[PDB]
Every structure is written in structure tokens, then in C-alpha cells.
Ligand binder design. Structure first.
Ligand SMILES: Nc1ncnc2c1ncn2[C@@H]1O[C@H](COP(=O)(O)OP(=O)(O)OP(=O)(O)O)[C@@H](O)[C@H]1O
Ligand SMILES: Nc1ncnc2c1ncn2[C@@H]1O[C@H](COP(=O)(O)OP(=O)(O)OP(=O)(O)O)[C@@H](O)[C@H]1O
Ligand SMILES: Nc1ncnc2c1ncn2[C@@H]1O[C@H](COP(=O)(O)OP(=O)(O)OP(=O)(O)O)[C@@H](O)[C@H]1O
Ligand SMILES: Nc1ncnc2c1ncn2[C@@H]1O[C@H](COP(=O)(O)OP(=O)(O)OP(=O)(O)O)[C@@H](O)[C@H]1O
Ligand SMILES: Nc1ncnc2c1ncn2[C@@H]1O[C@H](COP(=O)(O)OP(=O)(O)OP(=O)(O)O)[C@@H](O)[C@H]1O
Lengths: 362, 362, 362, 362, 362
DNA sequence: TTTTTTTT
């Protein structure tokens, strides 16, 4: 009649929960009967209803515990340990293979019985995106492969172009795809130390909107970024490890993650420019805005923001062999759903609408 | 029956594992039945497959205990305590001898060749590197003398040159073939005095670029570097037994570690001297880029970053007595393994190709 | 049947260890069966081999204990507490005996089984050092008892002299013998707050040359320092206690320490002169520098700044009566070495060599 | 058999010791056999020898304790509470009675059989100080009573005079007679805030060398202090509580304590002048200087600075009843002691001799 | 047997003590037998002699506890909890009624059998304050109502007049009567952030000496405060909640307290003029000056600053029904005491002769 | 004890 710390640790592992407060909160819900658990009846949250009946009996005794935070602490530690072990041992290809498996599990329930998504809407987003730039999907693949190999001195891509020209809109989807974080280099010289400290164990980073000093004749305000990146040239090249730091915790040391920069059409040092591998200079395209005006439901649902939209685009455009073996099994299934669910001229109609600037559906 | 904290502390000692999170993660892998273990079968990481057979019985009991992080702390303490003893009592030679042996062991896998690389790559590595500097081999040797003799005045070497000159990559490689840490000091020091616990218990530290107080008036970005160096002219001259402030990181009293100062072509007030072996020049020189461009495996496999790519240079030339008195058979074996495998006139291919600025493998 | 904490504390006292990782690491070395202990076989370190045989059985139980760092923390407190009892109750004369043991114990290493450096170079120092000043050894013993009696007003000697006159050099050797700190007063006034705050709690100090507004008559850089200096009478004469301070931190309130002033030959008021016991007018002088510029191995060993070479000089020159009575029984053992090893012609030759301006070793 | 924490608490109380480390160290000394205790034999510190025999039995078992520091921590907590109770509840006259009982204890040592200094030599100082200002002893009793009553506005005394007028000497002795702190207000308006925080919970403050304005018309260097004081009228007046601040801490509210001001002959605004209850000028006096020249032991033993000297003077001159009733019993025996140890003729002979400017003794 | 932690929790709740060392220190006093406790026999401190016999045995056991500070922390946190509860739940009228009860209790000691003050001197005090303004009691009654309603906009009062006019005297008395804190907005704009953190949870605040600018046309120094107050509009109007900040604590939110602004007769922006309900002008009145000269016990005993005198003014003047419902019983009884102690004739005679500036008492 | 506040 005592806490199975083991059963608690199973749940924290299986959910990948890594906040002690969230773990505590979630586990407590299992104290009441699953038998009439209205959340289970709603099938509302899988992280709840998948587990409640199994964990109920343990959670009933957990509710009486006087140690509760300590039990959750050791549970969370086990989840963090797995993250650390993986970060040292796995190849980046395998890390990314796992990241696909996570998102593909999420795409189960979104389209399952709960199913609250509409697959039509999400593919309108792909059609809008794929219309954005020539040969769109191939560019995503090239970024991902570069990110996988992590070729030293060849780690960063330049996105350039006017305000609202969609570079952030693209980038947000890429970041959700890989997992990673965003940071700002418009800050006072190398005073950014604890913000660059964010990048510990991250797979990818993205920097927003370098305020290129001197562009303001063209209404482009100046700022720190250009020369902060003139400074961080080792972080650009990645040819060395560095320290990074966070509070009431040890330092940590690693290669710095590869990433993306976004900027307006400020000038740039040709040398700093030569530290980037590649550019994408975005331009406004009115018909996409007119399309959006008539297609509000996308943004209400953040569809074009979402890495889930990119994944559907690759499942659409790419051969099955283009991805790691085990997920090819899943990718095959995700061909099947598209094959079944769309007539090809459905996508034609949709992308045809996008180009005509009508609402994507009609 | 009981968890044996002893058996855990053995594993920490033997792996030389040195973070509670890494250690905790590792040991929990053993809790599955060894006889079946897929990682043992797969032979993926020796830090597991060498040990799972032995520790499995104990890990079963470890997995149940309600205080797991405490065991890992005591075990990590033992590994760090071992390092702190040797941090005092060793001759400078035996420290460097320790550092070397592990590279030989890694080379045993690499070139006893259950590990992967083609030594031809790293011979080509030595070609690219050894071409960089007049008498580079002696430069490495002369550094090691200055290090192993801990020499006052001579305690620092000043790398002056443009960026992309390699000076930092060189310094970092000596942070491989020697232990040590990098450092930055270009700020008003008041609360920053707490940082150099990083330099406590170091044989060596490298001061990164002097972001000067004259600064961008030199076309080189500003900071507090030059004046801070001028101020701490006591410490650079080794005048002080280290009582710099901590940031949790605990105490080995020492003279401040020797090493390098680096400078992207900034100004210097002549007062800063009486305090080095010398200043040292560096330049980018296109043909070396021409070769690298034609040889970028040197960069992909990070050959040029490595201090492995300096160790191998030593083997190929020096009398074994210039190395440790004791280790001498190990180097003789590796000498033979490559003295057999090339004449100098073979990999003189690489030398003259690098000298010509042209690709360094066939 | 259990760890005796008592024996750990004895060892912690007898080592005078006061860092927890050091004590922990070392005491675990006693684990192995003492009879074969290879550190004992080699006689590596007495702090081991004088103890393992005694402590052995207890160290077995220690290694099996489940709270090791808690034992070590209490033992370290016992050692550091002893210092603070002594920090209260001891006279400056008894406190001076620390220096002598500190110096002699280090010197045992310096001429250890390693003969860590050839003691003959240290004696070649002792020779050259005595060459530098009229009645050099008496000039030291003058300063010694000057600093013992700490006599108010009668507290300070002015090291006057031109650039590169060895004043700082002798101060450095004196500061080696004695310890100290160095400070600057040419600073703007706001600095002195914390700058002088640095002087807090030290047995002796020096001031860097007072760059002073009139010296640039010579172009002696005309910092604020001399006008700044003649405000500070209460500190110098040590008549009355004074406040000191630290960044981010409180005042401290104490009698101001004694010590040394360097300067190059600015003008001064007799107002300032009266603060001093004494003045010394260094200059660079012929066969002293011109011997060293041959015998620069002593620059490389910095014996030219070695307070422990002053200690050998004292042991050579001075009556047994000149030293605190108990510790005379060590000094005799060093006298006996010097008598044999520097049989008189050895010493006489070395000094004579310097007196020929020619390499002190021949 | 258990440690008695109570005996440790009593020792911490009786020694009035409030550093956990100092307390710990001293209590350990008692574990060794009392009989042969060389500290006891040398009568080295009463804090030891007047206690070792009492505590020895408990100290031995305390030396076996596993938890030693917590015992000492609780003991220190006892003493700090006792201070804080007293600080909030005693009358000012009781606080001064405490200071006097304390000094009388130390004088029992100085002139006891241990005889650590000559009562002759200290009485030489009393004569010299009684000669420093007219009616010296009467002025001292006034000042003490003024601080004891602390009547609002009637709280501050002015010590104005040239350099080497001795005003610092008098202030030091008074501050030693009462306990208190010096302050500097030649700071700018920034630093004052933490400077005044020094005064927290003191009995006296002394303001040092307030540099006025325009003084170089009389060669006096000018500065902030006078103008700063005249803002602080409400701190001087002492009629309402003020907010006081320490670094890293919240503000505190209390009445600013009474005190003393020193300066050269600057002009004083009538506003500031009016807030002083007495002005006491000082003058240089040649016969004091020529007398003091020969009575060298006065400076070299710091007699004329010491509050022990002031306490002696009050005993020699004042009526018994003028003392608080508790110490009056001790005053009798000290008067009677001194009245044995000197005639009036002896004492008046010193005063006469000092007026002649000649070495004090014959 | 055991320590009753609950009896300590009573004693803290009883005494309202909320400092662990004051609580600790007092609780320890009781361990000696109250029967001979001289603090009891003296009845010197009510917080002792009321309680000693009651807590005797528990203190005797508490004196042997090994957990002493743990007991006290729990007790102290109980008292903090009560304040926190009341800080939310009470009305402003209850807070004022609570505050009045505290003062009445101290008055009953002061004028009790212990009688440590003379009610006639305190009544003499009341007369002088009545003469400071027209209709003084009506003014006080207006002020308190304005505070208790705390009506937005209508929250602040301005005191104005030349220096030595009584404004600070009245402010300090009103501040004692309600409780509150004083603040100095004349700082520069940065630390003013932390300055306002003092206002947290206060019933009331006072702004000192808000320095104008260009006041030197009126012989006044310029400053900063007024410009800062215009940057603080809504803090005064009390319409909206504000953020507040102490050192080393995360911010909190509340309506900023009502209060009083004080200045010498600078000019005011009409933007600032709009904040205030009312302003009161103070004129220097020499006959008060002459009265204080001849009535010194007023100042010396700090009568005229103390809120007790304002409460006496309220009791002697105001009709009973104006007081909060519960205390009307006590107030009636105190009026009855005052009518016993004085005829109106006597009070009228005091108020008369003050008007001619002769000393009060006759 | 850091981290924040102090420092700047
Ligand atoms: N190329 C485009 N043409 C027209 N409208 C666009 C384009 N790209 C994005 N939009 C619209 O502008 C909005 C903002 O786009 P986005 O933030 O990606 O632009 P941005 O140039 O990267 O801007 P910023 O630098 O401010 O982040 C989008 O949500 C979409 O509504
Ligand atoms: N001789 C060369 N000519 C041109 N490019 C070179 C040469 N040597 C190295 N490089 C390039 O410069 C890149 C950066 O080198 P590295 O950072 O070591 O230079 P550095 O001078 O030490 O720079 P910094 O001091 O600014 O960090 C290398 O990865 C390589 O691609
Ligand atoms: N008489 C001498 N014989 C040998 N070396 C000398 C002599 N005088 C000076 N030197 C050398 O001059 C160099 C500088 O000496 P040091 O720092 O003590 O001089 P300083 O006068 O204090 O310096 P500064 O020029 O800064 O005032 C040292 O190498 C010292 O050994
Ligand atoms: N009245 C005096 N007449 C002559 N010499 C004096 C007198 N008072 C002090 N001295 C000499 O001046 C020295 C300094 O004394 P002290 O610091 O007390 O003087 P001060 O005038 O108060 O100083 P400050 O200038 O620091 O205010 C004494 O040690 C003594 O040598
Ligand atoms: N009406 C008055 N007429 C003359 N003197 C007065 C008057 N009121 C107060 N005083 C005198 O002024 C002294 C100081 O009073 P108080 O501090 O309240 O003045 P203030 O003008 O408010 O000062 P500040 O503006 O400097 O804070 C009192 O102790 C008293 O001696």
C-alpha cells in the first residue's frame, strides 16, 4: 500500500513531461475514477485518457502522500536524463527521425475520431506556401539536409526582403518542424549572453529581423545585429565548441546549433554575407494577400505558421525513399490518406484559387 | 537487500563520467536484462556494452530506490575528488601524459581501425596545419616546454592577426592536445570577478579577442579589453595566488593559469609586456584557403579543429624522449604503424600540394 | 564497526587540508590494502605514505559509508576554524613564523627529491641578490623588524629611483618573502574608494609609482597621484584605525597596514616626505644587470624576484640569534646544507663572478 | 553519553562570542587534558584559561559529536537574540554602564599581575591629555552626559582647528570610550546614501574633515561636505526618525545618533553653525610637541589615542557619585589603587614638566 | 515531556512579535523563576512582567530543546500570516480603529500607575499644537476622514511654508497616528524605482521636501522631485493599480496609499496642483518660538511630534459619536479621566498663555 | 549564495 515511484516514472517518461508542476497536475487527475472520468468520456486529451485507467490505482495512494514534490522530482529527473543521454549519443539523422515520429503521432489524433482538424484546410496552406516561391518543397529539403549534416562553416541561411514579406511566416513553420528556439540579436553588443544561453541542447535556432545599421533613409531603422554577427563569427562557423550558461545551474559546453537569420533589405558585409551558405530574398505578392483576405480561417487556425503544414507538403511532393527507413512505413500510410482523400484536381482547384486571389476554397 | 553505492562509484570512476544527469541516465539503461540487451548486441556505445553484463544485478536494485540522485552525487563527488587530487600532486609532465594517453586510446579504435577514419585524411590534416606556420612543429613543442615548465614571464603568448587567420583555431587545438579553457574579459569587471572559477584548476587558459577600449576607432569593435589587461597586469605576470571570486564553482588555489592572449589586430599599450614569451603574427593567405576549399574534409571531419591533428605531427618527427619517460612503447607502436605506412616522401605529396595550395588527398 | 569521524578529523588537521574535495579524494586513496600501496612503495607523497598505514582500516569503512561529504565537511570546518582562532590570538611576530615555514616547506619542494630546480641556481640568486645593495642582508633585517614593530609614523620606506632601477624587483622579492598587495593613486578620486578598499586585511603592501602632476617636467607622467597622496596622513602613520570598503559590500574598520612606496623622481613636499621613515634611491648599476644579461637562466627561474632566495640569503648571512627561537632548529639544518653544498669557495666564486660582471655560474 | 548543548550555550554567552567558526574552534581546545594545558600554564587568554577546566568533560564528548556545527549555530543564535533584546530595551545610560564594565575588565588585565603595561606609562598619557585642552576632564564629563541624554537639537559638537591640532586624537579616544563610527561626507550626493547607512544602530557618529568651500583663500582644499551637512538638518536635529540604507538591503527607520564634526578653519554658514551645541577649537602648541618628542612611548604604544586613557582620567578627577551606581563599587577600588600608586606631587610634577616641553619622566 | 509550540505561538500572537531573534531573546528570559525575576519585580517591561509566570515551565523545557530556532520560525510565521489575512480582509475603518486601540493601550501605561509620563505635560503639548493652525482639531478630523474613505483624486494634501514652520512636525505626528512611511522623491530617476517599494502595504505615505526648480529667484535650491511627481500622476489620484518593487523580490501590485506632500514655497505646475484635495499654509509664529524656549520639556521629551498628542487632541475635543463604534466605550472613559484631571479653565489658561509666548506651565 | 543589487 505504497507509492510506486516506478509507475509514476513510467508516466513521466511516456508523456515526456519535463515540468514538475505539469507532471504533478496531470498525475493528480487520475485520483478520481476513470470509470466516470468525464475527460475520458469526452476523449478530450490523450495524455489523460490513454493513461487514467492504468494509473488510477497508483494515483489514489499518491493523493495521500506527504512527499509529493520529491516523487515528481525524481520522475522528472529520469526524463531529463534520457534527453541528455540522447543528446550525446544519437546522430542528428536519428534525432530528426524521432522528431518526425513525434509530429506524426500528433497527426494521429488531430485527424482521428476527435479528428478536430480539417485536412482540406491544411492542404490549402500547403498550396499557398508552395505557390510562395519557385520549387518550394525542394528548398525545405535542402535546408533539412544541411541541418542534418551540420556542415561546418556552412551552417546558416539568409532570409531577406520587405516587411510582411513572409519570411517569419515561413520560418515559424520550419522551427516547429525541427524543434529549436528563436532569439534576438538587436541587443547591446555581447550583452546577449543569457539569451544565447537558451541554445543548450537545441537542434536549431532562428534569429529575427536584424536591424541593419544605416538603412533608415529607406525607413529601415538601425541596430545591433549586423556587428553582433560580425562578432559571433565562431558561432556562425561552428568550428569550435563554446560555453553557455543558465542560473543556479552549472555551465554547459557544446558546438553551437545551426540556424536561420531574417532581415529587411539593409546592406550587409560581403564577408559576413559569405558566412551564410544561402539566401532567400522574399517579396510581397498581392494576390496572396487578397487570397488571405478571403481565407481568414487559415490564420485563425495558425495553419501557415505550423510545421505540420510543411510536413504535409513533403509527404505530398517527395518520394518515399527520401526519409529514414522506419518512418517510411508511416510515410507510406500518409501517402495513402492523401491518395484516398484528394482527387488531384482538388489540389488544382485549391492552388488555382490561390493564384487567382479568390478565397482558397470556393 | 541493498543498493551498493560502491558499485555505482566504480562505474563513475571507470567511465570518468562527470555529470549526475549523464551518469543517472547511463546507469538506468542497465536495468533491462543484460542477456537480451539490444545495445549490447548492437555494440553501439562501449560506455554501455562493456558494463551492462556486470552492473545489471545492481541496477535492478538501483532502479527501485527513492533517492537516486543522491547516489549519483556521491559518485560524481568521487570522480571529481580524484581529479582534484591529481590537479595538485601530479608533475606537469604526468598531466600532459594523461591527456595524451586518451588520444592514443581513441586512435587505437580509429586506427586499430574498429573505428572509422582514414589516417590519410589526418596526415593530410598535418599537411594543412604544418604548412601554416614556420617551424609549426617546434611552435607546438616550444609551447609545451613553456607549459610543462610553467614559466614565469613566459606564461603568455600573444596571437596578433586578422580574423580567418586560424589563430583561435590553433589555440583551440591546444585546448585539445592540452586541457584548458577559453576566457573573455572585455567588460567592466565589478560583478564579473565571480567568473574565473572557470580558470581555477586549470593548467592553461586562452584569452579570446581583446575587444579594445580604443575599439572601433581601430576599425575593430570596442570593449574594455585593453584597459582590463593593463589593469590586471599583476595577474598576467602571474604575481597573484588565485583569490578571484567564485560562482558556486569551488577552490583550487593556484597561480593564475598560463596560456595565450589573442588579438584581431587591435592596438596595445607597451606597458602590457614583461609578461609573455612573445607576440605572434597570423595572416589569412589565400592559397591555404585554396587547398582547404579543395580538401574540405579537413573541415567536415574537423581535422583542422582537432589537437589530434597536432599529436600525429609529433609522432612523425620527434625523439621519443621529448615525450614522457614512461609511455614510450605506445608512441613507438604508433610511430611504427605510420612510419611503415608512409615514407615522408609519400605524404610529401600532401606537403607540396598544400604548399601549392592544391588538394591534399589521393 | 563504523567510520570513526575522529580519525578523519585528525588527518584533516595534520594535512591542514581545508577543501572538501581534496580531503575526500585523498582519504579514499587509503582504501587499498596498505601493505602493497604503490604510492608508499615509491614514496610519492608523505601526506599519503605517512598515513595510509595508520588510517587503512578506517578508510575501508569510509569508502562503504553513504554520506561521505558530510564527514569531510565537518573535518574541513575543524581546520578552517583553527585558522580563525589563530587569526584572532596571534601576535605579528608569531604570524611572521607562518611565512618562514611556508617558505621553507616550499623550498623543500624546490630542492626536493626532484631537486625541482638546481639549488645552486638559487644560491647563485642569493649571491646576485646580495650583490645588489650595500649591506643588503642588513637592509633586509632592517625592514624585517621595521615591519614587526609597526611603529606609528615610523612605518614607510620610499623606494625612489629611475625607470628600471630594480625597486619593484626587490619589492617583488620582498613581497614574495612577506606577501602583500599593490595599488595605484594616480587614479581619479572616485577610484580610491574601492582601490584603497583592496588593501583590506593584508600583512604588507606596496604602492605603484605615483604618476604625479609635476613630473612631466621630466615627462614623468603627470597623473593626479601626488596631489592625491598628500591627504592620507591617517592611513600612513597608522596612529588611528580607518574604514575600508568593497564593491557591492560593506565597510571594514581597522588599523591601516604598513609597507612600501615605489616612485620615479617626481617632486614632493616635505609634508609628504615627513610621513616616511626613510628613503632609498635605486638606480640600475653596471655588473649587476650585466651579469644577469649573461646569466638569464635566473631571469627564467625569476630567482631575481625570489623571496625564498632572500630566505636562503638570510640563512647564509645572519646569526642564529636573528630568528624566532624554536624555528632555529630548522634553520640549522639549512645552514648545514649551505655550509657543505656551498663550501665557502662555491659561494665566494659565485659572488665573485657577479663581481666580474660575468655569469654567476662557471 | 550526550553532549550538553546548554554548556556550549553558556560559554558562547559568557565569552559573548557570536561567530560560529570562532566559537567552534575555541570550544574544541578544551578537549585536551586540562592539567597540562600550556595555554592555561601561560595564562595566555582568559577566554581559554578561565574556562578550560570548567568545560573539559563536556568538550571531550563534543569532540565526538557528528553534528558539531549545528550545536555552535544554535549557541550563536542565543547571543544574537540577547543583543537584539538589549538593543531594543536598555536605557542609554545602561548601555554606557555596559561599555564601562567592559573596559574595567580589560584594565584589570593591563595593570593586573600580568602587568601587560605600566600604569605609570598610561598615567603619563592622562597628564598629557589633561594638558591638551583647558578643563579637559570637565569637558569629557559634559560630552558623555550629552550623549547619554541625547536631547534633540542639543546633540552635536564642533571640533574646528588647523592640521596637527590633535582633534583627530581626541575624537578617536572618545569613539573608543563610547563605540561608534566615523563617516566621510566629502562624497557627492550619490554615495551619501550608503555612507549614512554606516550610522545604523550606532551610539555615536564622527564626521571627519568636512571640506568646505573657498578655503584655498586660506589654503584649505574645498569640497562638498559643508553644503551636504546643511541639507541634513533633520538628521542633526534628531527630532524624528529617518530612513537609513545598506547595500542589498531594505531601508530601516530610526533616529540618527549624536556625534562630532572635525574640520579646518572653513567659514561656517550661520544655519549650520546654529545646529551645534558646543564649538571646541584646537590649537598647535609647541611645548606639547617638544614634550611629546621625548615621550616617544606615548605614540609608539598609542596611549594618547586610547579610550583606556580617557577612562583613567575620569577616575582620577571625577567624584564617585558622578558614575552610575552599579560601577561605583569598581570605581572605589580603582581610585584607591591609583591613590596608592601615585601621590598628587607625582602627578602634578608630570603636568608641570609637560608645560616645560621636556621628556615626561624623572 | 515536550515543548508546547502552541504556547510560544500564543506569546508571539500576544506580543505581536514578528522578529525571530527578538522573539527568541525575550522567550529565553522567562527560564529563570519569575518569583525572583528582577525584571518582574521592577515591572520594567510589560512584554515581560505580564507573561513571565505564565510561560515559566514551557520556557524551562524550551531552554533544553535542540530545535529552538525551528520553534520560533513557525511561531513568527503565524504572526505574519495574521497580518497578511488582515491586509486583505479588513476595512480601512477597522484598520484605523485597530491602530487607535494600540495607542490607547500605550497611553494607559504612560499615564498609568507606572506613570512614566505626566499627563499635564502631554496636555501642555496639546495646547501648543492646537495653536499651530486655525481650527486644528477640525483639520485633523478632516484629514482622517479623507484617508479612511480613500476617495480617488481626492486623496492628497499639500503642506506649504518656509523652513521652521512645523510642517515636518505635523507630518511626523500624523504619520505616527495612522502609521505609514516617508519617501524621498528628490533622488534621480533610476533608484526611485526601489524607493517606492517602501510604500508596499502601508496605510499612508509622506513625501518630504519635494524640491522645486528655479526656486533661487526665491532664494531656494533647485532639485528634481517636482518633475518626478508629474511623472507619477496616477500614483496620487489612486484610480488605478500600480506595480511596486523591493530589493531581491519580484514585483507586486496594489493601489498606492494616500498621503501628504510637503515643500517650502516653490512654484507648482498646475498639472501637479490638480492632485490635491486641499493645501495648508504654515506661517512661522515667533510666540511659539518663545514658548518652546521656555517650555523645553515639550521638545526634550519629543511631545509635539508624537501621535499620542493628536489622539489626546481628538479625545479632548471631538464628540464621541465620531469615533468607531467599539472604542466609544474606551473614549468615553478617557474623556472622563481627562475631565477629572483638568478643568477646562486650566486647559484654557494653558492655551491662553501660549498665545503670548510665555512658557506653558503656571 | 547567487542573483540581484550595486555598480556605472
Ligand atoms: N510575400 C507576402 N506577400 C504578401 N503578404 C505576405 C507575404 N508574406 C506574408 N504576408 C502576410 O504578412 C503577414 C506577416 O508576414 P511575415 O511576418 O512572415 O513577414 P516578414 O517580412 O517576415 O515580417 P517581420 O520582419 O515583421 O517578421 C503574414 O502573416 C501574411 O498575412
Ligand atoms: N590562410 C587562410 N586563408 C584564408 N582563409 C583561411 C586561412 N586559414 C584559415 N582560413 C579560414 O578561416 C576560418 C576561420 O579561422 P579562425 O577562426 O581560426 O581564424 P582566426 O584568425 O583565429 O579568427 P578569430 O581570431 O577572429 O576567431 C577557417 O575555418 C578557415 O576556413
Ligand atoms: N642594478 C641592476 N642590476 C640588474 N638588473 C637591474 C638593476 N636595476 C634594475 N634592473 C632590472 O630592471 C628591470 C626592471 O626592474 P624594476 O621593475 O624593479 O624597476 P623599477 O625602477 O621599479 O621600474 P619602473 O621603470 O616601472 O619604475 C628588472 O629586470 C631588474 O632586474
Ligand atoms: N595640540 C597639538 N599641538 C601640537 N602638536 C599636536 C597637537 N595635537 C596633535 N599634535 C601632533 O599632530 C599629530 C597628529 O594629531 P591629530 O591627528 O590628532 O591632529 P589633527 O589636527 O586632529 O589632525 P587632522 O588634520 O587629521 O584633523 C599628533 O600625533 C602630534 O604629533
Ligand atoms: N509655527 C512655528 N513658528 C516658529 N517656529 C516653529 C513653528 N513650528 C515649529 N517651529 C520650530 O521649528 C522647529 C522645526 O520644526 P519642523 O521640523 O516641523 O519644521 P519645518 O518647517 O516643517 O521643517 P523642514 O521643512 O526643514 O522639514 C521646531 O522644533 C520648532 O522649534
Amino acid at each position: 500500500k505504497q507509492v510506486s515511484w516506478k509507475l509514476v516514472t513510467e508516466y513521466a517518461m511516456e508523456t515526456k513531461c519535463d515540468d514538475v508542476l505539469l507532471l504533478l497536475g496531470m498525475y493528480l487527475e487520475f485520483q478520481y475514477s476513470f470509470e466516470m472520468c468525464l475527460k475520458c468520456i469526452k476523449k478530450e486529451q490523450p495524455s489523460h485518457y490513454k493513461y487514467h485507467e492504468k494509473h488510477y490505482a497508483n494515483a489514489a495512494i499518491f493523493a495521500d502522500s506527504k512527499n509529493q514534490k520529491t516523487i515528481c522530482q525524481q520522475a522528472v529527473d529520469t526524463v531529463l536524463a534520457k534527453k541528455r543521454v540522447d543528446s550525446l549519443q544519437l546522430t542528428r539523422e536519428q534525432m530528426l527521425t524521432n522528431r518526425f515520429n513525434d509530429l506524426l503521432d500528433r497527426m494521429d489524433i488531430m485527424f482521428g475520431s476527435t479528428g478536430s482538424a480539417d485536412i482540406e484546410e491544411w492542404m490549402a496552406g500547403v498550396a499557398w506556401l508552395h505557390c510562395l516561391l519557385p520549387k518550394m518543397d525542394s528548398v525545405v529539403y535542402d535546408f533539412l539536409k544541411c541541418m542534418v549534416y551540420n556542415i561546418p562553416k556552412k551552417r546558416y541561411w539568409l532570409f531577406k526582403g520587405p516587411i510582411d514579406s513572409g519570411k517569419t511566416t515561413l520560418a515559424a513553420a520550419l522551427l516547429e518542424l525541427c524543434g529549436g528556439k528563436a532569439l534576438n540579436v538587436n541587443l547591446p553588443l555581447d550583452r546577449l549572453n543569457f539569451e544565447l544561453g537558451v541554445a543548450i541542447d537545441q537542434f536549431l535556432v532562428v534569429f529575427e529581423d536584424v536591424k541593419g545599421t544605416g538603412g533608415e533613409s529607406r525607413d529601415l531603422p538601425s541596430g545591433q545585429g549586423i556587428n553582433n554577427l560580425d562578432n559571433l563569427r565562431d558561432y556562425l562557423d561552428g568550428s569550435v565548441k563554446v560555453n553557455l550558461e543558465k542560473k543556479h545551474l552549472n555551465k554547459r559546453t557544446q558546438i553551437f546549433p545551426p540556424g536561420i537569420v531574417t532581415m529587411n533589405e539593409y546592406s550587409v558585409p560581403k564577408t559576413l554575407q559569405a558566412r551564410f551558405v544561402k539566401q532567400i530574398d522574399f517579396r510581397p505578392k498581392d494576390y496572396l494577400k487578397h487570397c488571405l483576405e478571403r481565407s481568414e480561417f487559415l490564420l485563425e487556425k495558425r495553419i501557415i505558421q505550423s510545421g505540420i503544414a510543411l510536413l504535409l507538403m513533403l509527404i505530398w511532393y517527395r518520394p518515399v525513399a527520401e526519409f529514414a527507413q522506419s518512418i517510411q512505413s508511416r510515410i507510406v500510410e500518409w501517402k495513402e490518406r492523401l491518395d484516398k482523400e484528394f482527387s488531384l484536381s482538388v489540389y488544382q482547384k485549391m492552388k488555382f484559387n490561390v493564384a487567382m486571389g479568390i478565397g482558397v476554397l470556393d
